[PDB]
Symmetry: D2
Subunit: 255 residues, 4 copies
């Protein structure tokens, strides 16, 4: 693992399930003091939790102020909380489109804005933003989601440039990962049949050169690496955890 | 020139000055029927103008309706209206940060959302979004601006994917261009002395491989190309009009 | 069209068929004085031809020296000559792998190296290199081809930076285009049945968001634009002519 | 550290000095069995070394055979051997230009070609290719070098796509790193005065957002991560270790 993460205060947003929970658990395994900021209670977890809606800047500020007071520092912030709904720009209501931007982009902006002042009071703090392989190659009927993930890359570069060399900021760009959100995405297409869901997921996995979809722990490994001193000269970039998806053209060749 | 642009209905937002004006002027020269949507009166101009705030969906929808019923179609929409102010995520007020996102991103979303239903009723319609070289290489203390320009790329790709093959959508990514906004940027750094402002602009020009900053008409040439049938198999991309800025590492080598 | 191209001397390599022939014909239509450098005679063509193997630097130099002497100048060079054979790095012989690099990369290097000295003696000369959508998203069993197309982008950036602002250099990145090479690629997979070939080609076309493969003339339009003064502030970039292929993730979403 | 790297057989080319040496040294610290393939003797070193010219396929194949038969497997291949000389496409001899391509590209191709058949017989083998930040943003008078580094990216993607899921292949893209080659670059500009060389290096460091040049060990950290199981779903990508250089536009803004 990354020994330097031990005992450091790590905040992870949206860590009650899926990738966020996997990230929180990895940091706990690294020995960090982890706090989850989410609207849902992670239940019996080894990490701390504060009820917090990332779209509410006042609650985000209060939660972060509380963490600094309780723990004495903040060394790592992982922005992960996000949502996805589908629809053509003409079908999705303007409210829902804006809501996706609010959670996926503004949530990252608020958490970063309020954590940074405290983070720079620590040695070599690091922010990791979870974007998507869709910051590059995109899906249909996902206007708001795709727009928000591209925005996250811009926010990431900005924070990196504005605060270097004291604080580093990078993003992780995952492709299809085995999470509740993805299983739900499949159900929205094939129904509740566990057999038919495995088929749709297998189809997606076969589209990735690695021939399977990713695991939450694989995204968590990239986050831990970027948050650690092992990435001391890495800032402003997105580490793609996509099983090769973003470099594959879907055009057959003779074999 | 592009003969196919003659008589086509072209909407350009923020065309009362700078790049937007050069774009409207180029389409007028191509024989198109051009309408400028902006909150400012362009004064004496060879193109039509409608008082419209791009961040007000009611005004945008109404303006687009006035154009379609009056002209009979809408073939090209050029989203250009934008703004920029500086400050670290820490100093800039949340309100100003949100405003930059509202104008630079939501303005593009509203105009596209309301124009698309009309545009798809015409043959080979196209949307061109003005992003920035900062969708790739960025500047300091410009997080809202940088985020918004990255967001525009995501919006562009999604409209391109959701509406191909009937409608194409691309972006233009300009570096430093001679515009009032760029002159305001210089002033905010070196004062109001017009001569010092010229020295600053020259410094920026020398950072571009082309050794000068770009001209509004050069951005307009790219927009006209992408809007034309000459770009019939081009969609979802950003055409960089940056004088080589984005491919240059600021690291000297032996000469 | 691009009026500024009229009467200018334009050299196009590999212009006896496919994209190269389409590029040569477009420049002839623009009124340019065009010369094809290839090993095959274009037969009855409106453009000039010189028998030339781009992998032979001495023949390339001699041919270019001859053109400058005969025509008095060289304003545009379009590097297009290329080949493709398939095979895993373990199956393709080292000789064939090297041969692909020789034609696809070294051919561009030789033509550029010998034309540049003459080109800078003209006003605003421009080089356009034909790369591929595979400079970004790639196909399987195409190691040498993919490597060569990435190399072409590096060569393009280098020439652009080294000679700005006098000479511009850009690349065009086409996806699947209807050419003899592509039809042959299909035959290598489905056989000579015109019905089965149309099916394979249709399959490829459906993978592009535009739902069809591109036409040679569409690539030629991008080349003419980049070679013209309409692209006066564009240098070091690749204009993707891919029908949206490079921005598409092959992952379904609910609809 | 990455516990999975213990006892794994790791080949590193050009590891007698600089980045290559730091990479070999890091793998030795991880408990791997490391073999350096280079034409130079690393002298006193904690890792094994074989006299081998990476541009000589007979020597490469023989060395890889000596390693597999002696150690029983090959789990990781790090292609690093490279060189750089300066000059415009016009001045540099064709022989020197070809040589840079031979070492920087063909050396990677030969080592990969001969190691792959052995590597795929082990579980989860991985190849890491050292490219450069110049696979994106480039320097002047370095066409052969720049071309070769872009070529390495194409080679990387193709090996990743052709051999997934059994073997992964990624690249590391370093910006300015403290190495002898970087010190030679400074000398070729400011002379042999060690103090002036330090001033030059400092200038380059200040161009990176991190305000310093990178350390060989920082590149090694990235290589070890990509070679490890921690990067199990990461393939075909380039991890930028550039201190933010590639996302920085050299354009000032108000402060
Ligand atoms: O790989 C594409 C992936 O993008 C991200 C999520 O939305 C999921 C999807 O499977
Ligand atoms: O070149 C970077 C440019 O980006 C865009 C504007 O904000 C201006 C700036 O000079
Ligand atoms: O779109 C991918 C295309 O790449 C290029 C050619 O090799 C052809 C292929 O169809
Ligand atoms: O940062 C750019 C760097 O690219 C690599 C080397 O050639 C060195 C240079 O300083």
């Amino acid at each position: 693992g990354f020994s330097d993460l031990r005992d450091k205060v790590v905040i992870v947003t949206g860590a009650s399930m899926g990738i966020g929970r996997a990230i929180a658990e990895r940091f706990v395994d690294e020995g960090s003091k982890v706090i989850d900021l989410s609207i849902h209670d992670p239940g019996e977890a080894k990490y701390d939790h504060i009820e917090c809606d990332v779209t509410n800047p006042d609650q985000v500020k209060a939660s972060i102020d509380h963490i600094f007071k309780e723990y004495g520092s903040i060394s790592v912030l992982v922005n992960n909380a996000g949502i996805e709904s589908y629809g053509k720009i003409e079908s999705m209501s303007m409210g829902e489109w804006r809501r996706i931007i609010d959670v996926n982009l503004f949530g990252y902006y608020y958490a970063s804005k309020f954590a940074i002042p405290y983070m720079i009071r620590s040695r070599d703090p690091s922010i990791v933003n979870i974007s998507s392989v869709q910051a590059s190659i995109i899906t249909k009927n996902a206007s708001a989601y795709v727009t928000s993930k591209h925005a996250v890359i811009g926010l990431t570069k900005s924070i990196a440039l504005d605060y270097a060399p004291l604080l580093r900021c990078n993003a992780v760009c995952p492709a299809t990962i085995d999470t509740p959100l993805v299983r739900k995405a499949a159900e929205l297409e094939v129904g509740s049949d566990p057999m038919r869901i495995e088929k749709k997921i297998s189809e997606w996995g076969h589209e990735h050169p690695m021939q399977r979809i990713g695991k939450p722990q694989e995204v968590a490994s990239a986050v831990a690496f970027l948050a650690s001193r092992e990435a001391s000269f890495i800032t402003g970039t997105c580490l793609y955890v996509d099983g090769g998806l973003s470099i594959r053209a879907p055009i057959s060749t003779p074999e």
